[PDB]
């Protein structure tokens, strides 16, 4: 009985040795796609920083990001937190932003749009803004890095459909 | 081409209350019910949460990872704006995930094929197929006496200390028709049980087609609410959108319902029996009713929710309501386990609502249903006569009662008793059952039809 | 610094306290009572103060410490007694010159005046050091030698400076780590939050048995080194003497004796008796107290401190597991921990759930028992410690239907159910063989095949004999013993012999204070061989009454096998048991 | 049985040989579709989505 | 010398609050309080001039919920003036208490002067440091065979008497007090009556007078007609007096806490008055904590020659030990003495059932030096044979006397000669431990030497 149990144990330990080798090789393939995926977002982050450095096509983008965050807050006052580079642009387009919020929200225009003395991290944030509550409680991290993170979380099935063909074993 | 859309989320930092497992916000802008939020602790670690209730501005959020360490001033709650969507894929099979769906197998985050809501959508009853395809579980007490049809929500009722884990692992190992994908959902089980299930699947070669959602006793307790829904939406994906045959093995649904009671008790709601939420029937129905076959699909979800009766009591709310929703049960008996019978399945409280459809008339064999009825009748007579002989002595027991006592002994000892790794085909189990029934004279066998009795005795 | 708003028993809602985290520790009152935040309702922060609450006024200050309840780990605890919040009771007595526990006393958990002999480890300057790595060892006492000084978990980096060999106290720097350009200074001790379990590399399936010393516990229902255990029973059943007889005579390299809701006289008995007891481990007779630290929370101490005592004890056990010692933490009453939780919940006004125990009681018990387990320590060098949690549940009324008992049975693996019927009539240990079980029976087959191959077969035979006799006695109490066959007579007689000699082990007698595994195995061999010889001789045709009258000498020799002193040694005792079997076969052959 | 159990390293190398086949396809697909995926991601990130809540 | 009394010469004026916001049950919700203490005992003055004491149980912001011991009947919101003392309930303790009779609230009903206080100690006390404890190893020879040979009371033990309504629990505890003495060479009893009737109180007082104990006893009589809320503080006052006497004056104090069933009933009534957890059978979930704060005040401490021995007399509601009061008391205390109705109706005095009884301090205080070397083995063997006798009696009642074996017949004979000779004593017959051990050895000599399987071989050879 001990020999039979040892044979069964050796037979059972034989399958595990093949199973562990199979799982490790299958996870290497899965981690290859995630490594290829991260290369896309790493290349996308570099391209996003290029859009911020244009300073000519960034102003239409930068104004849109504030209005997009302002329309979500839906309050007459806000505290825009932008990079130290963008403060001049924000102060230049404050009036246009207030008018756009007044027009896009079908409500009286923004009362005031304060630019916080505190600034975003230069290295961490490629561009964008972080529009916050008048009390600085409710904030919208509308930065380009945060938007890219949200896109990487959301559009992952679409990215898979773009890179690879539709799954062969997915009937419906 | 949907999904390519960015919607910035509202960080709040307006937490107003932490009452046990719940977190209350105070100034949410248009709060959405059953919404997922991402709490950012003062330490920097992120805990997910689900909006349980909403007021004009408040939003009671239940944190899945627990509320320990949640400050009121430096805790920021970010509203994702959508109910919990698990990223499912065909490559999700073969991986191990935490209670919240986060992989714990030292592998990459699952490369999403689609984002499926945990609650799913209620299948149209007109779109369901009646499950009439029996599964040969290898166990005699199940293949013969309470048959499981491919697409049945048949739980395992076992008290603490009983080998329900061993029985369910045996069923998973040997569950062919008279290959299955397994979606195992650990909820509050100990590391010993989790290691047992994982190692058994690895030894039997099931990891290639098993997705374990392990939520151990060490893991937080509010994640027991979320684990079975993730496992069942994974099973629904694999079985309806990829046309596989899935065997969902939710374990410790008693632990899940205890997590429900803890969540309900923090909300000061009107309680049910033993303090459980009044809507526990609804939650258990939402979880159990995610099993069966649909018309257009060639796939199935076989559900075997292991369930721990707190004190070996069927009348307890968890086993009661589950009996109500599920369609059967496999009652594991502490008395049988103490007697040493494996599997210690007590066939009297055990039941299978789909036996009458999946058994007999050419599906398995002409004698299956009659033999099962006769076995149940004789086992009940044996139990009653053994009680009568213990109370009022052996004189009260008649010849039929003595025969029933002998049959019960030879039935528990030789028919129910079956060591693990022993595959008893339904035909072999029926032959053994007939050998057990030949103890009785042909006349005394009551429920057996005359034709079957003449053809088989 | 907040202010007290509402006080009701052990809970204290404190106002003007914005910024308090969950489960943080606050110093409520002017005496700086240790507390823990349970809820944060706006600026209010409900606090469970771990000390007596009487005397607290509205408006008293409440300091926010900023850290959770942190047990202070390091060299020093070995032979100490603590107060649930890890306040050394000896130091408290010496500092206060009284017999009471002063309110808000802030004595250090680990004595700082003591100088420790630190010997540097394999790690040198420049070597990358991670959490749990042993960068040095200190000689604590003659029994716990080379108390490995572990780097705190969650702390990593390169060693900028490591102190050389010498004598250091706990305040002195021992090692300096630079990580991300920020130098961190490390000493002999480090604090670890009790709520968060200490990390390990990988928990393992426990295979080596925790030799309790009790015959029934060792044989019928064994427990492995690293397995959760449970001893339910009424009062007087013996769940405290089993705990003490397991903390004295087990093979565990250390003991964490935790008393929650127990009599102070019990802990005083431990203090008086353990120094006078000695253990053969480490190659010398060192006192037991040199390897057991005590977390004493007498039943009249503050209610809220029982959870703190449980968590402090389990974190001490996890720390010694991380050092690599097969520790076994012994909670005196998880039932009283549950009662403390129920009292706090009822004071909070939470929903009663079952019997008033809060709905999270099962989850907390499951987490605490999941703290156990044999595990490879987090850092290098490789080592495999264990925490064998053996907690004595004390169900109310001696009924195992209590919610705490049911949750503990769900989470644990060994159930040492005590029967008060056997607790009376001085049948100790009062283990109820019918309901008790051990799920480590199968996993101990490797150890048994290695050391005592026939041991599982003998325990299966003993279980069969006991179950058969239970059925036969249930029959006999109603239908008399006349109708029994001779085989049934033998079964009942040998099972009475087993219950009266083998299973019952007096824990205060010299011979049966500690019945080791080899003596227990030989005793099982003797009893099973006596039963088999009686069965065979009667099957040959001998009348059982005359056979028993003839072989009363052999029966009494078997019944006197208890008195073989284990102090005589393994060889001498085995020689006495070998002659017993030879003297048994000849007498049965003669008759 | 222990002698027959030998060969795990050879089995590991054989399994890695099959994995190396799919990695080449993964790299080729990534290199081919990187431009398109990055262009779509950039357009989506910088696209304006100014809109108030429905309620 | 004593600088503690130096702070005594200080006057602390007390705020008189007329701001009684509301009254409900035994509680008064009193608002506009200036920094309420959590456990201050207030002197509440009724409109009729009556003064009832009460202690705050909960304190919100400028609001204190006072529970009054005498009861809230007659309390008004316009006229009732509440005078906050600013300190917890402190009993004036002195060596002059010994020989006096006090009410349930600590006031003297002995028709003598108020206690000339030597110190004021909080009635709730403080937990004794477990490191400061000394394990009681000094056996008390109470003169009762069932309590001295089968069980054994060491000096700082907590050893209640579990009995029912009609059993002679008072007589047995009175016998212990008048016969208690160290086995190998006086006790200053402190008596606490909670909810007992005048007959019981007079019986205990007259028994102390007869035995000559009243010169060294303090009586805290809370009769059945006395307020129920102060049954909570009566044992606290008695045990604070005992703690003072023992630990400070270096005395050995017996503490008789009669009707701890009534104490637990008052505790349950107070808990149910509030919205508190029901524990089991309605008793509060913290009843373990309260009964422990009562019981665990007994014991011996290191460095002091005093000790406290507690014998809480407990009335079992339905003669079952699974009731919450007996179960929690058995969990807390270090044993129990079980007075049995099955023996009282049999006519045995004392009707102590040995099987349910227990003394956790028998291992210590039983040995070769403290007592005779055979005591532990003899006690264990007597327990075993008594249980065999009970089982044989049941089997005889079932299947007749004939079916019993030789061992069963011997065990029935031992049961008869044990209940009728060993347990049974006169109300004033005190049996030395050695006398009772000789009787026990006779009862064991009923058995053959072979059947005495509990006795160690050396003891059996030297004593059989
Ligand atoms: N194994 C044993 N050997 C000797 N005496 C025992 C044993 N078990 C229990 N006892 C006796 O029972 C008494 C009470 O047991 P204890 O440890 O207090 O159990 P519990 O804590 O459950 O009441 C002890 O004082 C001891 O004298
Ligand atoms: Mg105890």
């Amino acid at each position: 009985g001990n020999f039979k149990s040892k044979l069964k144990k050796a037979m059972l330990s034989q399958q595990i040795t093949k199973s562990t080798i199979a799982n490790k090789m299958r996870l290497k393939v899965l981690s290859a796609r995630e490594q290829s995926l991260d290369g896309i977002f790493e290349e996308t982050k570099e391209k996003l920083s290029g859009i911020a450095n244009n300073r000519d096509e960034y102003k239409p983008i930068l104004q849109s990001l504030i209005v997009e965050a302002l329309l979500k807050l839906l309050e007459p006052k806000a505290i825009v937190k932008a990079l130290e580079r963008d403060v001049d642009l924000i102060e230049s387009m404050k009036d246009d932003i207030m008018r756009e919020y007044g027009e896009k929200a079908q409500r009286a225009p923004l009362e005031e749009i304060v630019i916080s003395n505190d600034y975003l991290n230069k290295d961490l944030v490629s561009g964008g803004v972080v529009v916050s509550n008048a009390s600085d409680k409710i904030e919208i991290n509308n930065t380009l890095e945060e938007r890219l993170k949200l896109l990487s979380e959301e559009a992952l099935p679409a990215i898979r459909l773009e890179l690879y063909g539709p799954s062969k074993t997915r009937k419906f | 081409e949907q999904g390519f859309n960015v919607k910035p989320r509202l960080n709040y930092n307006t937490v107003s209350g932490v009452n046990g497992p719940l977190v209350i916000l105070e100034k949410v802008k248009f709060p959405r019910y059953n919404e997922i939020v991402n709490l950012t602790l003062p330490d920097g670690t992120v805990r997910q949460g689900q909006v349980l209730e909403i007021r004009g501005d408040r939003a009671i959020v239940q944190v899945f990872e627990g509320t320990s360490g949640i400050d009121v001033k430096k805790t920021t709650v970010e509203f994702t704006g959508e109910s919990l969507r698990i990223p499912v894929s065909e490559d999700m099979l073969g991986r191990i995930f935490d209670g919240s769906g986060r992989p714990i197998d030292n592998g990459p985050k699952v490369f999403a094929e689609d984002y499926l809501d945990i609650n799913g959508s209620p299948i149209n009853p007109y779109a369901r197929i009646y499950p009439e395809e029996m599964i040969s579980t290898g166990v005699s007490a199940i293949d013969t006496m309470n048959s499981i049809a491919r697409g049945q929500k048949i739980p395992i009722f076992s008290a603490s200390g009983l080998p329900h884990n061993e029985i369910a692992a045996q069923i998973c190992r040997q569950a062919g028709l008279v290959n299955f994908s397994i979606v195992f959902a650990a909820m509050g089980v100990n590391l010993e049980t989790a290691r047992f299930f994982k190692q058994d699947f690895e030894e039997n070669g099931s990891l290639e087609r098993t997705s374990l959602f392990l939520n151990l006793a060490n893991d937080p307790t509010i994640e027991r609410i979320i684990t079975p829904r993730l496992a069942l939406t994974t099973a629904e994906y694999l079985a309806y959108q990829t046309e596989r045959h899935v065997l969902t093995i939710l374990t410790d649904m008693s632990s899940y319902a205890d997590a429900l009671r803890e969540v309900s008790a923090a909300r000061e709601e009107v309680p049910g029996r033993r303090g459980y939420p009044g809507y526990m029937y609804t939650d258990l129905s939402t979880i159990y009713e995610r099993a069966g076959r649909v018309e257009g699909r060639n796939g199935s979800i076989t559900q075997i929710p292991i369930l721990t009766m707190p004190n070996d009591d069927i009348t307890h709310p968890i086993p009661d309501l589950t009996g109500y929703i599920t369609e059967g049960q496999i009652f594991v008996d502490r008395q049988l386990h103490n007697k040493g019978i494996y599997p210690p399945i007590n066939v009297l409280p055990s039941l299978s609502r789909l036996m009458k459809s999946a058994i007999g008339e050419g599906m398995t064999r002409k004698d299956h249903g009659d033999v099962s009825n006769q076995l149940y009748a004789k086992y009940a007579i044996g139990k009653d006569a053994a009680a009568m002989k213990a109370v009022v002595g052996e004189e009260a027991l008649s010849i039929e009662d003595k025969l029933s006592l002998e049959f019960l002994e030879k039935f528990e000892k030789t028919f129910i008793t079956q060591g693990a790794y022993e595959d008893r085909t339904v035909f072999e189990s029926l032959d053994q059952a007939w050998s057990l029934l030949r103890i009785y004279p042909k006349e005394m066998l009551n429920r057996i039809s005359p034709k079957i009795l003449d053809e088989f005795y | 610094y907040g202010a007290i708003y509402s006080v009701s028993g052990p809970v204290v809602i404190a106002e003007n306290m914005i910024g308090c985290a969950m489960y943080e520790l606050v110093k409520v009152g002017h005496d700086n009572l240790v507390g823990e935040v349970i809820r944060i309702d706006g600026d209010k922060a409900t606090i469970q103060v771990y000390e007596e609450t009487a005397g607290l006024t509205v408006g008293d200050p409440v300091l926010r410490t900023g850290k959770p309840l942190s047990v202070e780990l390091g060299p020093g605890l070995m032979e100490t007694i603590y107060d649930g919040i890890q306040r050394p009771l000896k130091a408290i007595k010496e500092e206060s010159q009284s017999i009471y526990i002063p309110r808000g006393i802030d004595t250090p958990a680990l004595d700082r005046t003591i100088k420790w002999q630190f010997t540097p480890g394999k790690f040198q300057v420049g070597d990358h050091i991670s959490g749990g790595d042993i960068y040095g060892s200190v000689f604590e006492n003659s029994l716990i030698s080379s108390h490995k000084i572990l780097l705190p978990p969650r702390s990593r980096g390169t060693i900028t400076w490591i102190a050389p060999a010498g004598e250091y106290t706990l305040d002195e720097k021992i090692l300096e780590v630079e990580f991300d350009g920020k130098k961190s200074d490390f000493t002999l001790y480090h604090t670890w939050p009790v709520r968060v379990p200490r990390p390990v590399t990988e928990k393992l399936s426990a295979d080596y048995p925790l030799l309790t010393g009790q015959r029934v516990l060792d044989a019928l229902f064994p427990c492995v080194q690293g397995g959760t255990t449970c001893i339910p029973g009424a009062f007087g059943c013996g769940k405290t003497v089993i705990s003490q007889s397991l903390s004295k005579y087990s093979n565990s390299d250390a003991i964490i004796y935790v008393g929650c809701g127990e009599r102070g006289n019990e802990m005083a008995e431990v203090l008086m008796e353990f120094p006078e007891l000695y253990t053969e481990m480490s190659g010398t007779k060192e006192p037991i107290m040199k390897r057991t630290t005590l977390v004493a929370n007498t039943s009249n101490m503050p209610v809220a401190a029982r959870e703190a005592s449980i968590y402090t004890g389990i974190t001490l056990a996890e720390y010694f597991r991380d050092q690599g010692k097969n520790v076994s933490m012994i909670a005196d009453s998880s039932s009283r921990w549950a009662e403390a939780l129920r009292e706090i919940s009822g004071r909070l006004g939470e929903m009663p759930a079952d019997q008033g125990f809060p709905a999270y009681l099962g989850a907390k018990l499951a987490s605490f028992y999941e703290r156990a387990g044999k595990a490879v320590a987090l850092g290098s060098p490789d080592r495999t410690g264990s925490v064998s949690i053996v907690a004595a549940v004390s169900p109310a009324g001696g009924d195992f239907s209590d919610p705490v008992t049911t949750a503990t049975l769900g989470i644990t693996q060994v159930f040492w159910g005590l029967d008060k019927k056997l607790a009376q009539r001085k049948h100790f240990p009062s283990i109820n063989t019918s309901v008790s079980y051990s799920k480590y029976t199968n996993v101990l087959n490797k150890f048994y095949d290695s050391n005592y191959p026939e041991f599982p077969v003998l325990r299966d035979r003993m279980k069969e004999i006991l179950s058969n006799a239970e059925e036969l006695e249930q029959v006999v109490q109603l239908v008399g013993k006349s109708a029994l066959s001779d085989s049934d007579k033998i079964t009942l007689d040998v099972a009475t012999l087993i219950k009266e000699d083998f299973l019952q082990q007096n824990g205060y007698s010299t011979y049966d204070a500690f019945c080791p595994i080899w003596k227990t195995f030989d005793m099982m061999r003797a009893f099973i061989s006596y039963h088999d010889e009686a069965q065979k001789a009667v099957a040959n045709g001998a009348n059982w009454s005359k056979l028993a009258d003839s072989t009363g000498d052999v029966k009494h020799a078997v019944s006197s096998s208890k008195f073989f002193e284990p102090s005589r040694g393994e060889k001498e005792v085995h020689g006495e048991f070998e002659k017993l079997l030879s003297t048994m076969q000849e007498r049965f052959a003669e008759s | 049985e222990q002698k027959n159990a030998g060969g795990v390293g050879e089995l590991e190398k054989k399994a890695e040989a099959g994995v190396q086949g799919e990695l080449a396809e993964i790299k080729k697909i990534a290199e081919k579709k990187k431009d398109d995926v990055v262009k779509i991601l950039i357009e989506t990130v910088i696209k304006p989505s100014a809109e108030v809540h429905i309620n």
Side-chain angles (χ1 to χ4, degrees), chain C residues 214 231 233-244 263 266 332 392 418 423 426-430 504-509:
Chain C
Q214 317 286 289
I231 316 165
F235 57 96
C237 279
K239 85 194 66 74
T240 305
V241 69
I242 286 169
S243 300
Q244 274 158 1
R263 323 156 183 72
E266 271 175 0
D332 216 336
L418 301 168
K426 307 297 115 172
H427 179 279
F428 301 111
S430 56
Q504 156 182 156
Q505 161 171 354
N506 181 318
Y508 298 131
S509 66

Side-chain angles (χ1 to χ4, degrees), chain B residues 110-113 115-116 118-120 122-131 134-135 137-139 141-142 144-145 148-157 159 161-165 167-178 180-191 194-201 205 207 209 212-217 220-235 237-242 244-251 253 256-257 259-263 265-267 269-272 274-282 284 286-288 290-297 299 301-311 314 316-322:
Chain B
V110 59
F111 196 75
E113 258 180 30
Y115 281 94
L116 296 194
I118 60 169
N119 313 298
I123 303 284
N124 200 354
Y126 201 79
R128 286 291 260 271
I129 297 169
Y130 188 36
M134 183 177 176
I135 297 169
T137 45
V139 182
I142 297 174
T144 293
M145 282 215 68
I148 301 177
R150 185 181 66 188
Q152 180 179 352
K153 44 212 181 162
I154 175 163
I156 298 175
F157 289 0
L162 303 188
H164 39 280
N165 304 323
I167 296 164
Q170 181 176 197
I171 286 164
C172 294
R173 173 184 331 123
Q174 60 190 1
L177 290 169
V178 60
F180 271 42
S181 307
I182 306 141
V183 178
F184 174 71
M187 301 166 256
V189 302
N190 43 300
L191 183 63
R195 223 191 299 110
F196 157 70
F197 267 113
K198 192 188 306 180
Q199 161 202 286
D200 202 352
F201 291 166
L207 266 295
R209 49 200 158 75
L212 298 104
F213 290 14
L214 304 176
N215 178 276
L216 317 181
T221 311
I222 314 299
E223 261 176 0
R224 281 88 171 275
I225 314 287
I226 197 67
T227 299
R229 304 194 147 71
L230 298 164
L232 279 168
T233 184
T234 290
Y237 176 81
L238 297 174
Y240 301 151
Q241 315 191 8
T242 80
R244 298 176 155 98
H245 298 287
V246 183
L247 179 72
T248 312
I249 292 284
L250 319 174
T251 181
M253 301 286 312
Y256 158 77
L260 273 180
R261 195 172 55 173
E262 153 193 25
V263 167
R267 278 152 63 65
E269 302 207 279
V270 181
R274 318 285 293 261
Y276 290 98
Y279 58 90
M280 182 156 88
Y281 182 95
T282 298
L284 292 190
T286 301
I287 296 169
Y288 293 146
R290 296 171 85 164
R293 302 195 292 117
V294 293
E295 293 179 353
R297 276 74 160 165
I301 290 186
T302 310
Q303 194 146 27
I304 299 170
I306 308 160
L307 186 134
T308 296
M309 294 182 286
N311 203 329
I314 285 286
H316 185 254
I318 288 154
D320 204 4
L321 295 172
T322 279

